[PDB]
Amino acid sequence: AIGVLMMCPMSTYLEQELDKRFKLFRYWTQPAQRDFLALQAESIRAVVGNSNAGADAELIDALPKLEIVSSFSVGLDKVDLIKCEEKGVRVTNTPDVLTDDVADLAIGLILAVLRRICECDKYVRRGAWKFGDFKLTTKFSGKRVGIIGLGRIGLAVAERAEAFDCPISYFSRSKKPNTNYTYYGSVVELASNSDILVVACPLTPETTHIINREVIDALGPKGVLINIGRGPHVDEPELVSALVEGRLGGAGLDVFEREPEVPEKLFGLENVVLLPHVGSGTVETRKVMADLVVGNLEAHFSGKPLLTPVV
Amino acid sequence: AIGVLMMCPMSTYLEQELDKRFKLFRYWTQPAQRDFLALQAESIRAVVGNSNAGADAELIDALPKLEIVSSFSVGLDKVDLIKCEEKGVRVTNTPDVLTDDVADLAIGLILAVLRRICECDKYVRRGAWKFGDFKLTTKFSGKRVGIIGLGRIGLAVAERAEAFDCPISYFSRSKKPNTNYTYYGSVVELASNSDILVVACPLTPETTHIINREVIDALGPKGVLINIGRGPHVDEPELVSALVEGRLGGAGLDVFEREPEVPEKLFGLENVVLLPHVGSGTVETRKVMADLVVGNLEAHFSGKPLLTPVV
């Protein structure tokens, strides 16, 4: 059997589908990993990763028979693509098939923060409705929605938001032709012109902390940050502090700079919503993603064109 | 000054705007109400109500100089329209200007229930992310959305849902022409053909408990009820029981049969979201609603056509 190393427990269904076609190895269940590696290097010809654990230089080097990294994710920042090319390794990912769900999440977060849906449900559950009305909140429809990275997921968000009458603005390195959204040439100018700012760009050293104190200052005390990209896209300590002090209106967060660690100071804030990276986390979508990873592995090991190759 | 009786504390801004133009009376702050009534009947020429307290037969009769009931709401089920006509009383309401916000709430509820946004945020806040992943949830995009009452708010919901690729179905007493949504001639058939069922019709004796056990049975264990209409539209005890037992997939509720009382058995359910009637509860919308009530009062007392008359 071909040895396939799965980096972490990302999908029981994927475990099943991999185990019936290959020799599935469960990296996360080995106490002494380096030795394990050394011990099964001769067998491991594929790596299956995701947004928590991919294939870095050091792993790739310990896996000298590695032929392909098939990521259970669209994001690729956990995979060393350069190293991959130097050692002959293909790389595939899962684009588009999760688009719908991550953009639905971004809209869910907007509403949950502006309409305090989470705070309302808690208010009710502790019997506080008996003593009075919940406070007034903020209207979503018609608000200015700015999107950083008008890509597959950014476009999907934009089109949902349009149906709520939101004026759409965006920053990308380049303007998407034939779109009537407002292009801005800098994240800071975008944030000044947005009630709501959505992060939908990939993570690279060039977009690391693209949400900084300046941007946060530009967004302001009435402004709301939606992060469905990657944790390190934001200078988390400056995000936490602007929220604690009231210098940023609020935030809906699916990803954190050091997940699953979430700064506990956020835990007492009522102008934030915090989710454990669930953008793609539905039965329907994880299924298709899993079949896609399988598909790429089965294409690779049978000499066919890969399905969603990146490298 | 013209005596205006405000039934309950619905809007500080409205209190302000009323108090600067009329003699504002605060019904809710009188211990012995019947006597109060008797005592200020000669002065009270207007009633301002809302969805919690309107103007019933008995109140109208105790207010023999009553000329107009201006409701701080679109719903009119708290106003006795027949009695109003017999005693010469105008009635106005606030249609359209809250449409956006109540339909945004319905979408917010759908997402918050299908994507367990509220359960996710709680999971995070109690440190559970450190021990593992939140469970998989349900995709909203593409699901069958059924709407009971394709009116101002029902249409607004339908058009939002379309942008998530949802097939739209509806039941109204009559089919809206030129719409390509699927008309069904009965709520039960609608529920059988819906993943998500939204209540957006007015409350009358004819729609009371329109959501019954049969409908609930039709919706089923994977089906999700969204109630943004009125509490008594549902047979609450049968709703509670289907949720406790798992016979209904889940529910997002803005209104309850006996608000603000909410059946505490709901408090332990993770497949429900509970909000204290906040459909219209934003600074932006309550402002416009308040100016509308004022507008109708100022039109009435100055012999002009009313703005949003119903009676």
Ligand SMILES: NC(=O)c1ccc[n+]([C@@H]2O[C@H](COP(=O)([O-])OP(=O)(O)OC[C@H]3O[C@@H](n4cnc5c(N)ncnc54)[C@H](OP(=O)(O)O)[C@@H]3O)[C@@H](O)[C@H]2O)c1
């Ligand atoms: N929450 C979650 O579960 C979750 C799930 C999936 C994905 N994600 C994140 O979402 C990202 C986006 O996915 P996608 O599928 O939509 O990919 P995508 O189609 O590649 O879109 C990415 C976009 O970002 C823009 N971009 C790239 N580099 C940029 C830069 N330096 N500055 C500004 N904009 C830049 C691109 O525009 P230009 O080329 O013009 O600049 C493009 O619009 C992933 O990489 C991942 O990190 C999160």
Ligand SMILES: NC(=O)c1ccc[n+]([C@@H]2O[C@H](COP(=O)([O-])OP(=O)(O)OC[C@H]3O[C@@H](n4cnc5c(N)ncnc54)[C@H](OP(=O)(O)O)[C@@H]3O)[C@@H](O)[C@H]2O)c1
């Ligand atoms: N959550 C909250 O804060 C909140 C806020 C505002 C309003 N509401 C509720 O929302 C309701 C709807 O408001 P709206 O502004 O959208 O009013 P609307 O425009 O009158 O729309 C009502 C709709 O319900 C349908 N309908 C009326 N009677 C019906 C019946 N017996 N059976 C089935 N359908 C019936 C109508 O269609 P047909 O005539 O063809 O049957 C119409 O589509 C209000 O009356 C109120 O109770 C709740």
